[PDB]
């Protein structure tokens, strides 16, 4: 046994009790033993008689940090306290006992504050039949503190924005002689200084101080306060230029150069780090090891006497998995029609249906009780971790699918589920979607169809082993087979793999392991239905030098995180690879990673912790992460609990000022949304009422300052009541126009916003992310398509905030200006409007060039994503000749590739089938961009597939991914792609206004 001493609350000194515990005893037995011994040993036994053992917690110190022995069913052996003491040679054990304590009122207030911010209570335990969520909440504590310890308050507060990629070639034109001019605005002076592209802010500031050291008076810098107390800040925005990086490595400077705008900066004292304090943690750290059960040697029974059996290793069992279905009950019928209904059960790993069984159809009613046993061919020992026991209620006449529900055969702590269960089933809104993998039950336990099942218990928990990766000792292949295999490895990501190829790869798997790109294909071939194969695969993954040395390839790493792979280690190595990404790439892929969080079978993964760390380590990423998750909670009832847990685990470490900012932004959005809902519910009366309500909101506590959601550096000020108005639309968005709260803003331009209601934007948000990724690719390709991404975002159910593109008019309006409301589309109209808006011919030429660029970029993008069939009433154009699209929310039998109306031809001048320099330049740029883009077919396909899976709600089918593949012309010569793209261009040219005119008629109808 294990001699252990337990401190005791009661004193004249705290009492102690040495105890011997079963070597394999669990925590519950030890608690019983401790209570029983205390009842006898206690000086004041009545004190311990009044309370039960549960009224106390076991805290033990590890180097000074209290840990609590949480899991009451974990075995005493796995505790790290014993191991650490052995390392420390401390014995018998010392475990302080502390009575529970009610949370402080301050704690309750803070908790309610966090709940308000999240928009959904986290402390609820209603729609759950487990403990996974609370357990995960306690688990996530340690990463938060660890990351917080290692963060520099200075840079964390200033949160400078940088990058490290080489300058695009076209931009090196702007910089000449490795120098550029910087304007410094200070108090009431503007001084310009020439500085090389490789002078850090510190060096530049010191040089400036030396230059003006004699003239500090005018500069208005106190003699006492030296240079240490002043750092640059971008005028008019809350973005700094600090750190140690060449001046060309700050994203803001590159943006300014691209815009051809003189860089302006202003000195300012550092932001106070004290504002970033975090409330001292209110919990003891949960013990180290909780998800490790042991090695199969110890957890088996063979060689052990039954009286000395504490647990049964799962692999020892070898029967057939068996379940009992009792019945299904619903309050009221879904329809009035005699239909046979039968339940169908399946065992599924990832998206692969390991096995299926079906019951007897019966005359459907509100209540149908079966009480029948189902036995799958699959034995118990071959259940992989994370398997899903899908259940469906097929209402026959094929049989419609009505409801369904998932269930984890193995719970989080590796213990086969056993006992009775009552589930609440979801209702259906293709082939597959990200909804079917939800592990949660329907919150509406009142009127939601519910089912009852039974799984046979056992005299002991049937735990699961953890592999003992003992090295595997396990020649050259025939060259023909090598060629065949490599060709197979060279196929597109979506190309299906036949059984023969899978067998070959697994057989020649040590060959593939010597090549990173083969990894995603190699694990699909693995057969998941056998314990032996799993053991071999873990042995294979143990040796991971090739993957580690592999250069980071984000496109590949994404493939791993797809739903295909539900292994623990696969997604572990994927996250490992992601750990090396810098911040800007994370900003690029943040939305897709947050989406991918859905596929994780369990609440806690490597992905969640990685996101938490990156968010806590920086501000900007934290801001965008906050808004994305908050959008997820409000909408997706399937996963609201998981995201709620993650977001809570986050918001407890961000700091103070960040919390206050979130408070203000959320309040403002809520007020505006409420007003919008009230207004849209119902002429000039509407505008007057809206203006009155805005006036009242000012009269209310509508805060005066808040960082705009999609642009943290921009501080909105006080609304301009008069400049607002209501647009004319079927959904009637609001048009708000704030004004910046920075007194140092160079210009008086307003901050535009459009506030839309009654439509989801997540489709639009995802498409905009895709466009930004594409823009990054092309920039890496050293070009400039002059695409126009604008910051859209959703912040609730059918409510969204959209940036306002200043000086921007839809093409439909321009058409109505001359033609009106007939349908004719004269081509001279757009050119005439642009020419009128551009009196200077040089401005006209520049605008035409930019127009051609943007048209090319948007045509390519829409064609790639296959949504180029945009009506002629969703495209905007700026007065600068820039063009772009909007309203990517409805677009998710002639089918024109993309909109290239003849008016555009007239703009470029080559009307009809004639040609000129402009048209050829357009085509050349289009082809260059198209090939440069095709260079990343893998990344594009994987991202598009992820979008479809986790995007539109309706079931998806492989037809969409088929199309996308087709389009790019995968696996074809460069000349073939050139010809194909030119063919698409010519097809668009030929048709003319016919399709758009038909769209106009259909919309009118």
């Amino acid at each position: 046994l294990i001699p252990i001493e337990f401190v005791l609350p009661t004193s004249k000194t705290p009492e102690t009790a040495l105890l011997h515990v079963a070597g394999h005893g669990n925590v519950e037995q030890m608690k019983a033993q401790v209570w029983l011994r205390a009842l006898e040993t206690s000086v004041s036994a009545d004190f311990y008689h009044r309370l039960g053992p549960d009224h106390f917690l076991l805290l033990y110190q590890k180097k000074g940090q209290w840990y609590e022995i949480y899991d009451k069913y974990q075995v005493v052996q796995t505790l790290d306290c014993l191991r650490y003491w052995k390392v420390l040679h401390r014995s018998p054990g010392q475990i302080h006992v502390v009575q529970r304590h009610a949370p402080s009122e301050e704690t309750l207030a803070f908790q309610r504050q966090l709940n308000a911010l999240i928009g959904y209570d986290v402390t609820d335990v209603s729609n759950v039949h487990d403990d996974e969520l609370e357990f995960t909440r306690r688990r996530l504590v340690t990463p938060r503190m660890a990351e917080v310890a290692g963060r520099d308050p200075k840079l964390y507060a200033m949160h400078p924005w940088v990058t490290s990629k080489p300058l695009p070639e076209y931009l090196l034109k702007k910089i000449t002689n490795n120098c550029v001019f910087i304007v410094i605005h200070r108090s009431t002076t503007s001084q310009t200084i020439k500085v090389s592209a490789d002078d850090t802010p510190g060096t530049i500031l010191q040089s400036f101080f030396t230059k003006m050291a004699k003239k500090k008076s005018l500069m208005d810098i106190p003699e006492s306060q030296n240079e240490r107390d002043f750092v640059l800040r971008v005028c008019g925005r809350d973005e700094y230029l600090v750190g140690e990086t060449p001046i060309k490595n700050f994203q803001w400077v590159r943006q300014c150069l691209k815009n051809g705008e003189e860089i302006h900066l202003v000195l300012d004292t550092p932001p106070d780090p004290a504002l970033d304090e975090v409330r001292k943690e209110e919990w003891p750290l949960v013990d180290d090891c909780t998800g490790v059960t042991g090695y199969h040697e110890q957890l088996t029974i063979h060689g052990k006497d039954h009286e000395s059996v504490f647990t049964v290793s799962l692999w020892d069992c070898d029967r057939k998995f068996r379940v009992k279905i009792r019945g299904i009950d619903i309050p009221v019928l879904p329809r009035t029609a005699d239909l046979t209904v039968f339940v169908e059960a399946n065992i599924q790993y990832g998206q692969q249906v390991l096995c299926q069984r079906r019951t007897s159809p019966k005359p459907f009613t509100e209540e149908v009780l079966w009480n029948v046993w189902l036995e799958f061919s699959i034995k118990i020992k071959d259940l992989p971790k994370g398997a899903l026991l899908n259940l469906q209620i097929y209402c026959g006449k094929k049989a419609q699918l009505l409801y369904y529900v998932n269930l984890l055969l193995i719970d989080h702590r590796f213990l086969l589920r056993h006992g009775e269960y009552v589930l609440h089933m979801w209702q259906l809104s293709g082939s597959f979607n990200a909804d079917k993998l939800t592990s949660a039950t329907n919150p509406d336990k009142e009127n939601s169809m519910s089912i009852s099942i039974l799984l046979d218990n056992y005299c002991h928990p049937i735990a699961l082993p953890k592999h003992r990766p003992t090295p595997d000792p396990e020649a050259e292949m025939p060259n023909q087979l090598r060629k065949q295999l490599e060709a197979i490895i060279a196929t597109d990501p979506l190309n299906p793999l036949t059984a023969e190829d899978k067998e070959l790869l697994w057989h020649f798997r040590y060959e593939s392991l010597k090549d990173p790109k083969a990894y995603p294909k190699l694990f699909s071939s693995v057969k998941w239905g056998q314990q032996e194969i799993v053991a071999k695969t873990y042995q294979l993954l143990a040796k991971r030098e090739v993957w580690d040395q592999s250069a980071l390839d984000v496109g590949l790493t994404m493939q791993l995180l797809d739903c295909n792979f539900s292994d623990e280690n696969v997604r572990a190595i994927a996250v490992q690879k992601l750990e090396s990404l810098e911040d800007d790439d994370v900003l690029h892929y943040l939305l897709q990673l947050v989406q991918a969080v859905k596929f994780e079978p369990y609440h806690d993964s490597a992905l969640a912790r990685f996101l938490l760390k990156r968010g806590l380590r920086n501000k900007r990423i934290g801001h965008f992460l906050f808004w994305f998750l908050r959008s997820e909670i409000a909408q997706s009832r399937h996963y609201q609990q998981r995201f709620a847990v993650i977001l809570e685990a986050y918001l407890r470490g961000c700091g103070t000022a960040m919390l206050h900012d979130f408070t203000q932004q959320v309040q403002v959005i809520d007020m505006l949304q409420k007003v919008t809902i009230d207004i849209k519910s119902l002429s000039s009366q509407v505008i007057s009422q809206l203006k009155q309500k805005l006036e009242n909101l000012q009269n209310l506590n509508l805060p005066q300052s808040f960082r705009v959601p999609y642009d943290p550096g921009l501080k909105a000020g006080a609304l301009v009541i008069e400049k607002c108005k209501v647009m004319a639309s079927k959904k009637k968005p609001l048009w708000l126009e704030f004004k910046c709260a920075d007194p140092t803003a160079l210009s008086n331009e307003t901050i535009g916003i459009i506030f839309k209601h009654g439509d989801d934007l997540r489709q639009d948000m995802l498409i905009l992310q895709i466009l930004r990724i594409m823009e990054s690719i092309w920039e890496t390709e050293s070009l400039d398509l002059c695409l126009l991404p604008y910051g859209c975002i959703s912040t609730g159910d059918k409510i969204g905030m959209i940036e306002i593109v200043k000086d921007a008019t839809t093409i439909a309006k321009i058409q109505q200006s001359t033609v009106g409301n007939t349908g004719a589309f004269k081509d001279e109209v757009l050119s005439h409007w642009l020419k009128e808006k551009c009196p200077i011919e040089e401005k006209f030429q520049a605008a035409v060039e930019r127009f051609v660029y943007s048209c090319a970029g948007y045509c390519v993008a829409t064609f790639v994503l296959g949504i180029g069939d945009r009506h002629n009433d969703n495209i905007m154009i700026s007065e600068t000749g820039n063009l772009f699209h909007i309203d990517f929310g409805h677009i998710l039998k002639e089918r024109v590739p993309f909109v290239l109306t003849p008016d555009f031809l007239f703009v470029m001048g080559t009307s009809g089938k004639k040609t000129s320099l402009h048209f050829q330049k357009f085509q050349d740029v289009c082809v260059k961009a198209y090939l440069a883009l095709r260079h990343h077919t893998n990344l594009l396909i994987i991202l598009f597939s992820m979008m479809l899976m986790t995007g539109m709600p309706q079931l998806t089918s492989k037809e969409d991914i088929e199309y996308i593949r087709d389009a790019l012309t995968v696996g074809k010569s460069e000349e073939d792609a050139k010809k194909y793209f030119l063919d698409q261009i010519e097809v668009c040219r030929d048709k003319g206004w016919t399709v758009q005119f038909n769209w106009f008629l259909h919309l009118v109808l």
């Binding site: 029974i301 049964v312 069992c317 009950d329 309050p331 009552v422 046979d456 056992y458 005299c459």
Partner: protein, 502 residues
């Protein structure tokens, strides 16, 4: 062998009635048969251990626990117990309750290996009641019969069983002979020991028996069975020496091992014209775990349930005034002369052995009474009746009810296995409210005489018309017809159980 093949054939035919008795008789002819039989089971048993057919597990267990408990001696050369131990040590992966059966068998096998014969001595000592001071326990057998209902053949069986055939002196003789035979194999002359004992007085015989049983238990307590067996053999040799009859034991030349059929336990028979069990309480005037009152009620459906009423009644009486338990940890055994039908549908073994119903019938009865060791409960419907004058009573019934030969207030909460209490009120004028027991509980199909109709219910309440007295029946019994009732609540409610093989 041909005899072995016939043994296997008889066992197989049993598995699929009198097969059990026939098999018992066949094995009882030669001690060797026992081992032979025990082999075949461990073969067939292993088969299931791979095929995963649950049903056949429960019967075999019993057979095994029977066979081993009857064999006279186990030569140390035989390892069959090791085979049984290894075979059953791999069943713990099985669900509940099969794991319970396997655990009990493992305990029993450990006992036997440590010190053979312990089980037989314990069973016989409890049955005859000649218990030791350290382990003081006893047993009883009560046969409650209704002469008219119980047929003359059953009456003859009861009279024979109540016959006091044996004597404590013979009990000591048999127990000592059996213990020595089992321990020392054939190296003893049972005839010589019997002759020497027949001259020995009751006091000395009982003292020697008590000492031998104490040595038995002590050996069973030892850790290492291998050494414990030799230790106990030596101790018994010393005991025989001290008493003065060592010569019969340890004979180099083996004798001829003899089967020792289990003795006959005490039995008392009482007429039970009444369906009220209180009769037994009277005999009380005439520790719970130290013994049990194996009441043996002869079973007729009609009265089966009407007597179950009595059983449950006294069940409540003692649950509230526990006194019978202080005397005996009671156990009840129904004896078909539909409480059986339910048992048979749940446990087929019972349906094929008990429901089918020294003479064959007597042997079957003894066997059943001694090996059926798995209490089963029945569903039952509690109700509370409030009378005209505010009197409130609690009753329990299982068959049906009849209320009427009025503005009956009828409220009921239908239920779903999921747990949806679909309340409902039907305040309709009815005359005859007949509750039918339609057949995881079930739902009595309440009936009403207004155009008639009948529907199921789960928990019901009936309120009369302004304190209107309405007659209520109990399980169709026209004898007990309670009246002056104004309110009636009905709902299902949940050691003296309905002993079944299970």
């Amino acid at each position: 062998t041909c005899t072995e093949d016939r043994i296997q054939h008889a066992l197989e035919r049993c598995l699929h009635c009198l097969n059990c008795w026939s098999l018992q008789e066949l094995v009882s002819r030669d001690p060797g048969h026992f081992l032979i039989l025990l082999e075949q089971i461990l073969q067939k048993t292993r088969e299931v251990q791979e095929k995963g057919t649950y049903d056949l597990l429960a019967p075999l267990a019993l057979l095994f626990y029977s066979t081993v408990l009857c064999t006279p001696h186990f030569p140390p050369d035989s390892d069959l117990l090791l085979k049984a131990a290894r075979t059953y040590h791999r069943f713990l992966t099985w669900p509940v309750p099969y794991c319970s059966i396997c655990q009990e068998l493992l305990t029993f096998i450990d006992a036997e290996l440590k010190a053979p014969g312990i089980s037989y001595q314990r069973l016989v000592r409890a049955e005859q009641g000649l218990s030791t001071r350290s382990h003081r326990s006893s047993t009883v057998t009560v046969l409650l019969l209704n002469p008219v209902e119980v047929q003359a053949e059953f009456l003859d069986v009861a009279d024979k069983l109540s016959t006091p055939g044996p004597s404590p002196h013979s009990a000591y003789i048999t127990l000592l002979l059996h213990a020595f035979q089992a321990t020392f194999g054939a190296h003893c002359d049972l005839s010589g020991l019997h002759r020497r004992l027949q001259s020995k007085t009751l006091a000395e015989l009982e003292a020697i028996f008590t000492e031998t049983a104490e040595a038995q238990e002590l050996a069973s307590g030892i850790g290492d069975a291998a050494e414990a067996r030799q230790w106990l053999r030596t101790k018994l040799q010393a005991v025989g020496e001290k008493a003065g009859f060592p010569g019969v034991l340890d004979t180099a030349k083996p004798g001829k091992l003899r089967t020792i059929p289990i003795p006959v336990a005490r039995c008392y028979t009482y007429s039970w014209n009444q369906d009220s069990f209180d009769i037994l309480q009277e005999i009380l005037l005439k520790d719970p775990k130290a013994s049990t009152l194996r009441v043996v009620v002869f079973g007729s459906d009609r009265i089966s349930g009407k007597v179950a009423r009595a059983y449950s009644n006294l069940r409540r009486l003692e649950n509230n005034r526990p006194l019978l338990t202080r005397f005996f940890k009671l156990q009840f055994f129904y004896v078909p002369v539909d409480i059986s039908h339910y048992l048979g549908m749940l446990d087929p073994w019972y349906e094929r052995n008990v429901l089918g119903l020294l003479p064959i019938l007597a042997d079957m009865l003894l066997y059943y009474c001694r090996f059926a060791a798995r209490p089963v409960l029945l569903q039952v419907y509690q109700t509370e009746l409030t009378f005209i004058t505010g009197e409130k009573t609690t009753e329990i019934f299982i068959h049906s009810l009849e209320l009427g030969h009025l503005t009956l207030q009828i409220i009921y909460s239908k239920g779903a296995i999921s747990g949806r209490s679909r309340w409902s009120n039907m305040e309709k004028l009815c005359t005859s409210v007949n509750l039918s027991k339609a057949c995881s509980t079930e739902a009595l199909t309440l009936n009403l005489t207004e155009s008639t109709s009948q529907i199921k219910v789960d928990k019901v309440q009936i309120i009369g018309s302004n304190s209107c007295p309405f007659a209520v029946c109990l399980d169709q019994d026209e004898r007990k017809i309670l009246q002056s009732v104004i309110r009636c609540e009905v709902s299902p409610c949940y050691c003296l159980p309905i002993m079944t093989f299970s």
